[PDB]
Design a protein around this ligand. Structure first.
Ligand code: NA
Ligand code: NA
Length: 279
């Protein structure tokens, strides 16, 4: 299958070189897999989700996405036009309020909820969790991301947006999950992207077109936009039977585009997420 005039990020994860416009992907498209988006929620009713998204849990007064962030990240995972895995099942967990903020105890509660809730859903190809959030080091936030991963969910987290070593941010600094840096359309590290030894992989994160609230779309930048490229790719490869939740991050790093990125400081991986599609 091919999507012509795809957003640059989709095109980039199906190509060995930058500057193409076509997203080459197997027509299976993540059917049978589930991705939990733990964020500000999802506008489930966006025509771009085709009825494949629903809210399962909120920690606030409403389940509605009043922000747009969560809907953007959900769109890059599995919307029709803007998504990596175009036939995946999207579940929204709202741990962030409509200003994009949330206490660590609510974020911990949300990860433990997904570890339980996956057991009463139909996801034969497997479960991904996408966390486009973080702040300063907490051993509790890390420990909870480790519990979600250990329970059999592929966990993708944002490296963070401070142009700093990700080692001082959670859940970014938790070794056992998949920590995602951001690249731009010329194969440069996004100027805001965290780096360091703890990073596993880079995705597209600068000028990413995806879904937004009120049935709209817009372009935003961040490791928040890169993370769902990787969660999507993991759901996609799990549907193909090429890897499992336990080892998807390591399989994505093995099969990645090597050495193509610039402004990668010594000690950080030069690995860019790639689906390895052959028609
Ligand atoms: Na290359
Ligand atoms: Na890791």
């Amino acid at each position: 299958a091919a999507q012509t005039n795809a957003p640059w990020g989709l095109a980039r994860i199906s190509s060995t070189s930058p500057g193409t416009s076509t997203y080459y992907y197997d027509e299976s498209a993540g059917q049978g897999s589930c991705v939990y988006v733990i964020d500000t929620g999802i506008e489930a009713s966006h025509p771009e989700f085709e009825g494949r998204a629903q809210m399962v849990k909120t920690y606030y007064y409403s389940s509605r996405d009043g922000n747009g962030h969560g809907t953007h990240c959900a769109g890059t995972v599995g919307s029709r036009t803007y998504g990596v895995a175009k036939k995946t099942q999207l579940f929204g967990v709202k741990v962030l309020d409509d200003n994009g903020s949330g206490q660590y105890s609510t974020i911990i509660a949300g990860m433990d909820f997904v570890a339980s809730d996956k057991n009463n859903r139909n996801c034969p190809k497997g479960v991904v969790a996408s966390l486009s959030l973080g702040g300063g080091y907490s051993s509790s936030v890390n420990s909870a991301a480790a519990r979600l991963q250990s329970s059999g969910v592929m966990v993708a987290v944002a490296a963070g947006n401070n142009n700093a070593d990700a080692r001082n941010y959670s859940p970014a600094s938790e070794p056992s999950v998949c920590t995602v840096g951001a690249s731009d359309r010329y194969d440069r590290r996004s100027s805001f992207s965290n780096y360091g030894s703890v990073l596993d992989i880079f995705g597209p994160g600068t000028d990413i077109l995806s879904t937004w609230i009120g049935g709209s779309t817009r372009s935003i930048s961040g490791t928040s936009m890169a993370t769902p490229h990787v969660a999507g790719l993991a759901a996609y490869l799990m549907t193909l039977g090429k890897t499992t939740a336990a080892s998807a991050c390591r399989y994505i790093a093995d099969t990645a585009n090597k050495g193509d990125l610039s402004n990668i400081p010594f000690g950080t991986v030069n690995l860019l997420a790639y689906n390895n599609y052959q028609a």
